[PDB]
Design an enzyme around this catalytic site. Structure first.
Site, mmCIF file in Angstrom:
data_model
loop_
_atom_site.group_PDB
_atom_site.id
_atom_site.type_symbol
_atom_site.label_atom_id
_atom_site.label_comp_id
_atom_site.label_asym_id
_atom_site.label_seq_id
_atom_site.Cartn_x
_atom_site.Cartn_y
_atom_site.Cartn_z
ATOM 1 N N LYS A 1 33.672 36.807 -22.650
ATOM 2 C CA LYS A 1 32.388 37.105 -23.285
ATOM 3 C C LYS A 1 31.278 37.107 -22.235
ATOM 4 O O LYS A 1 31.154 36.177 -21.451
ATOM 5 C CB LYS A 1 32.077 36.097 -24.402
ATOM 6 C CG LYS A 1 32.986 36.250 -25.604
ATOM 7 C CD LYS A 1 32.603 35.301 -26.730
ATOM 8 C CE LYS A 1 33.401 35.559 -27.993
ATOM 9 N NZ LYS A 1 33.147 34.534 -29.043
ATOM 10 N N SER B 1 22.216 42.729 -21.499
ATOM 11 C CA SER B 1 23.640 42.882 -21.802
ATOM 12 C C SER B 1 24.427 43.313 -20.571
ATOM 13 O O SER B 1 23.962 44.169 -19.816
ATOM 14 C CB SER B 1 23.806 43.957 -22.869
ATOM 15 O OG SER B 1 25.176 44.262 -23.079
HETATM 16 O O1 LIG Z 1 30.948 47.461 -22.239
HETATM 17 P P1 LIG Z 1 31.345 47.177 -20.803
HETATM 18 O O2 LIG Z 1 30.541 48.017 -19.780
HETATM 19 O O3 LIG Z 1 32.841 47.360 -20.600
HETATM 20 C C1 LIG Z 1 31.031 45.413 -20.409
HETATM 21 C C2 LIG Z 1 31.585 44.445 -21.441
HETATM 22 O O4 LIG Z 1 30.589 43.452 -21.626
HETATM 23 C C3 LIG Z 1 30.862 42.482 -22.575
HETATM 24 C C4 LIG Z 1 29.660 41.594 -22.760
HETATM 25 O O5 LIG Z 1 28.503 42.254 -23.212
HETATM 26 C C5 LIG Z 1 32.111 41.719 -22.152
HETATM 27 O O6 LIG Z 1 32.397 40.717 -23.078
HETATM 28 C C6 LIG Z 1 33.269 42.682 -22.010
HETATM 29 O O7 LIG Z 1 34.441 42.023 -21.582
HETATM 30 C C7 LIG Z 1 32.916 43.819 -21.061
HETATM 31 O O8 LIG Z 1 33.930 44.799 -21.030
#
Ligand SMILES: O=P(O)(O)C[C@@H]1O[C@H](CO)[C@@H](O)[C@H](O)[C@H]1O
Ligand SMILES: [Mg+2]
Length: 218
Positions: free
Chosen positions: A45, A114
């Site tokens: 997370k 994020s």
């Molecule tokens: O959406 P992404 O660019 O793959 C980045 C993503 O962010 C999430 C948090 O916001 C993480 O929990 C996740 O494992 C990750 O893949």
């Protein structure tokens, strides 16, 4: 009074932490790694896409080629992106829309902090983009949570000191990032996962402007 709120997305604005979990678990199992359960997923997370993949590979002491690593990250993201196409405003978590409205009425800045490159797409799906004064682009911030960089960047983008900001998070890594940025964290989730040393609420209905003020005063 605090002058900005810095929002994680997945698991704070909507239930997309669950979607990331399901997608990572599917990937892991395709490559014969069966240890991505809910408990392990607490370590994923808030963490960048590759750092997440690498944790999964390390979990199993598995080594793949650089070419395969790239394909696996893309494979999980392509699946995740299909999984979120039907997200809509009805999927916004309880309390969040009203919080955004109340913050803007009170001239408190709103920024996204994020890890997700899918953040802007999700805010558009949910008709939330217009609430945000800034989105910190995680591709421009090399250091993933738990480094504080993304929260520092989010605060800077709205002209507010981290020390005068609240950060909202559902993750271990993100709580640490908020702490080290100087902002005040309020976590959403279970104390067994997120700790007992900051304020933790069980669900996002608790994220009211009234409560953020209550916490800020202390
Ligand atoms: O959406 P992404 O660019 O793959 C980045 C993503 O962010 C999430 C948090 O916001 C993480 O929990 C996740 O494992 C990750 O893949
Ligand atoms: Mg999250």
């Amino acid at each position: 009074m605090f002058k900005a709120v810095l929002f994680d997305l997945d698991g704070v604005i909507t239930d997309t932490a669950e979607y990331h979990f399901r997608a990572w678990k599917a990937l892991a199992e395709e490559i014969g790694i069966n240890g991505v359960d809910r408990q392990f997923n607490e370590q994923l997370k808030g963490v960048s896409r590759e750092d997440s993949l690498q944790k999964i590979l390390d979990l199993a002491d598995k080594k793949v080629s650089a070419e395969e690593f790239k394909e696996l990250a893309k494979r999980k993201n392509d699946n995740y992106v299909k999984m979120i196409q039907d997200v809509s405003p009805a999927d916004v978590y309880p309390g969040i829309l009203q919080l955004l409205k109340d913050l803007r009425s009170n001239k408190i800045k709103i920024a996204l902090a994020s890890a997700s490159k899918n953040g802007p797409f999700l805010l558009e799906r949910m008709n939330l983009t217009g609430y945000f004064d800034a989105i910190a682009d995680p591709a421009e911030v090399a250091a993933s949570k738990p480094a504080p960089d993304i929260f520092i960047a989010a605060a800077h983008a709205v002209g507010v000191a981290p020390s005068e900001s609240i950060g909202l998070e559902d993750s271990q890594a993100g709580i640490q990032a908020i702490k080290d940025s100087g902002a005040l964290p309020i976590g959403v989730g279970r104390p067994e996962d997120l700790g007992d040393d900051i304020v933790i609420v069980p669900d996002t209905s608790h994220y009211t402007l009234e409560f953020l003020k209550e916490v800020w005063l202390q």
